[PDB]
Amino acid sequence: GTRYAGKVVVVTGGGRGIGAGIVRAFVNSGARVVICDKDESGGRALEQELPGAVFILCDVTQEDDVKTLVSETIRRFGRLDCVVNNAGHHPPPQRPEETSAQGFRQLLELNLLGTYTLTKLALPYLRKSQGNVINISSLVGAIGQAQAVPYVATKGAVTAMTKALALDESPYGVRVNCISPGNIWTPLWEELAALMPDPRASIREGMLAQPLGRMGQPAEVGAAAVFLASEANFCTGIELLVTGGAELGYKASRSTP
Amino acid sequence: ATGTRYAGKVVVVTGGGRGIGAGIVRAFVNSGARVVICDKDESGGRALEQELPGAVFILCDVTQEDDVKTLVSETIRRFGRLDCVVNNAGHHPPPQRPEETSAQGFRQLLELNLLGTYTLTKLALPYLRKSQGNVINISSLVGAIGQAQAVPYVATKGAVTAMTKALALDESPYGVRVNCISPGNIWTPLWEELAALMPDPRASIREGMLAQPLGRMGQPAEVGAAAVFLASEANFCTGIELLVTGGAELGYGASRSTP
Amino acid sequence: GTRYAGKVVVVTGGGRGIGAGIVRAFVNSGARVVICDKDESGGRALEQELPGAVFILCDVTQEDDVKTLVSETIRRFGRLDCVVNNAGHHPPPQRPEETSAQGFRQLLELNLLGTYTLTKLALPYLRKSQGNVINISSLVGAIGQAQAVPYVATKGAVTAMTKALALDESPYGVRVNCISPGNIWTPLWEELAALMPDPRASIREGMLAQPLGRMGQPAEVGAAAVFLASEANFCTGIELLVTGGAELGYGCKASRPS
Amino acid sequence: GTRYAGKVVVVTGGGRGIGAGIVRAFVNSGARVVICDKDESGGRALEQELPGAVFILCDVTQEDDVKTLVSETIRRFGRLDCVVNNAGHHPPPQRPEETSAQGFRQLLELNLLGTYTLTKLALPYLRKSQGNVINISSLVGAIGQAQAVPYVATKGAVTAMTKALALDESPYGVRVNCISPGNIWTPLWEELAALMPDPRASIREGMLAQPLGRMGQPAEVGAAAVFLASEANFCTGIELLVTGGAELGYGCKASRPSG
């Protein structure tokens, strides 16, 4: 593909899963993609697979790493067109009493402040290229989830911050958007399902958790990101739902039994 | 003892004869208002009159412009003012897949569920401006997030919620607020009768209760309390959609990012 | 050129403005496009301009026109992959007192029931192809607009109906989504501004209603439609905002503290 | 009072502005109100003025203060029915380049993590009383604001956290809701306008950002909070907008046609 040929993209948390789907979609559209991740195993494997991808061992919670990430991207490739902030962690299920303020702070560092720091340091270069920012949030930021108070809070912050940044950078023509995935299949999901008491039933339940009757794929998140970067020139501050309809009344009305 | 939160005020409730509408009537009567019930449901409207001296029933079809004109005329002639219009008239058809619906049926449903609200609101606005009154439209959560087997109904309630916001903008210079309430699953005597005919009534009742995080269905009185709030204490709210759903729209019942 | 190659797309109201931008975007993606519109000249002209595109003189409020649109599309191509319901009309500004029930009914016919009728007739073929429906709504269905009660109501209905249809047709793998444009610069926008007391000032207000400081283009709505048809395979029941950020932040909502 | 008579309410950030409006609303409804606020806040004066209000010198970012707040409330009054989390700060206008990660962390401590800590410590008692939580968020969490990246992020977090908490506490019958005010006229608003070169013009812009043509009052936020506590028994996880319609319609979002 050539929809993003000659462009340079940074993807944080790009080493596997959703992030790697985003990396792959951008490489397939002709872009040069810099993977910033602490997941060296996955980032190196993706670099091995995809000639247009470059892996940098990089922790978005460390300001020095982010500074080096940006300066190396510009040194090596001369420009920066798109930042995709996918770094972030979903803790295991935890009731409010099973969480701590210290853990909440740690999760805000990774899921929110890493996005903040990279976006801030990238903006001078994005202004030069009339580039754009894509934040990967979550449907649970919009409608909540049980047993995930810290995670939900961090993703509500990301979606709101996207809108604030969109307003602040609109005079420069720099768009800032987010994608909110629902249930996305990954190899990790498949491995965990195989250890359930009834894998067939657990898999079917996951597929039926949204109206489309299957889980999403990383490539589908990736295609949404390439759209936002390359063709959505009048979109800024939007939340693009990639959920298979999970937020719909599927929540089905019981106004009659 | 009659309450005083809306004492001396005059309220019109369309579709007020039973169910959600009657809960709204009762809430306003108990807040001290004179409430005019506009409905074709004479049985329910007359029963409410017998229970509630503060309510008055008028046989009234909001799809008939002459009926709406008579409704407003008579309300002003008898009671001298109009402070709040609650547009609750509306029908939910039985479940129908798209291929089981007709354009003619859809048009009929728009007449009852949307254009009746439009006609009454238009005719009431001169009087609402005089009283610095307000409009409350009863929509539905399904207008916001959809439901299966209800394309016409969902469309009509999406229209009501949007029209609420347009009207709020148009009437804001006059200080007339326009808001809507979107109920979720509300218990009624009809609901309880229908559940008894299900293959497993106990399971159907439990399913209905568990369809929202709060673990019960809502009550008409709760929709009524929300309407009294919007009329009497929400003076900086206009164009809002007040959800009365027990959390049904929330990520309940839920992420499967892990199996 | 190949993102949607070989796929059959129907666009109602495709003769000008937003609709023509959608038609052009789908032709550029390799699709075969059937244009349904009432403008003979503009429709024939697009057909002449875009090889492989087909124009049918077609009024979606007429059930016989809709039946012919579907039947002749299937007769021509044997398949139907995407229906884009863009037909619709925006009236001039009208205060509530200046609207009528009859005018409201006729706007519901144009803006809502045409979409309903075509979608119903198309769904059997869309199920066969695992195709999709794209409804063109408006931002004002979501946030309201002044002096537009009937229009706003029709677009709130379209957006809600999209979600209902998505729920009904997801068992068949048929996605149903909508695009909500904000201010898109078109001859229609220009014609509406010409009715204003100061057209230049109205156009400038329209541009400054977006944080981006410009209005959108038909081509941008068209690109969003091609995305929804060809690459948004896990999206159903969504409202894709193409608004330039008009819904964001505070702005001037009243004319000349608590 | 009597809408919330015999109940016990904690209001963080209750000393002035919106918070003081909430305190007064609950005292007027018959509740005993415990103010958690700092030394210079106004809370001590509210205790002087209002026999129904109690002031506790209390910084929600300090876990020991929050523990003392809850333990003293229970020791004195034996129950806790409602927690209103209004503590929070709006920084002056700041472009992204004028913000720091350290400042952002500090703002998350005050605006988000204080609400988290108090809610967690209050929940055993709210379960006993079938009480409720009200978080004061902001419209800008939903639609953004210019020159406020950290503030907007914190309020987006509060609104989302409200929904997560609603899901976690619905099994116990504990409702968790938020109020999102828009422009409310307060000393804080006036102080921010005074930073501007033309304060009168900034105030007029602030008034005209609402279709109603005015800003809101602390009392109007307070009335919304009393509704959520006392009458919104089928509402959980909602965002109650108290904004005067600021989110509705088109308005001026850029400064001096499709490129």
From Swiss-Prot, chain C:
Pathway where it operates: Carbohydrate degradation; L-fucose degradation
Protein name, per record: L-fucose dehydrogenase
InterPro entries: NAD(P)-bd_dom_sf, Sc_DH/Rdtase_CS, SDR_fam
Tissue expression: Highly expressed in brain, placenta, liver and kidney.
Residues noted as binding NAD(+) in the record, renumbered to the chain: R16, I18, D37, K38, D59, V60, N86, Y151, K155, I184, T186, L188
Annotated transmembrane regions: none
Record-annotated active site: Y151 (proton acceptor)
Uppermost EC category: oxidoreductase
Result of altering Y250A: Lacks of activity of testosterone 17-beta-dehydrogenase (NADP+) and estradiol 17-beta-dehydrogenase [NAD(P)+] activities
Activity's dependence on pH: Optimum pH is 8.5 to 9.0.
Record note on quaternary structure: Homotetramer.
Organism of derivation: Homo sapiens (Human)
Substitution effect: K155A: Lacks of activity of testosterone 17-beta-dehydrogenase (NADP+) and estradiol 17-beta-dehydrogenase [NAD(P)+] activities
GO CC annotation terms, alphabetical: cytosol
Catalytic activity: L-fucose + NAD(+) = L-fucono-1,5-lactone + NADH + H(+); D-arabinose + NAD(+) = D-arabinono-1,5-lactone + NADH + H(+); L-galactose + NAD(+) = L-galactono-1,5-lactone + NADH + H(+)
UniProt keywords, alphabetically: Carbohydrate metabolism, Cytoplasm, Fucose metabolism, Lipid metabolism, NAD, Oxidoreductase, Steroid metabolism
Protein's job: Catalyzes the NAD(+)-dependent oxidation of L-fucose, yielding L-fucono-1,5-lactone, which rapidly converts spontaneously to L-fucone-1,4-lactone. Can also act on D-arabinose and L-galactose, with lower catalytic efficiency. Does not use NADPH. May be the initial enzyme of the L-fucose degradation pathway in mammals.
Localization (cell): Cytoplasm
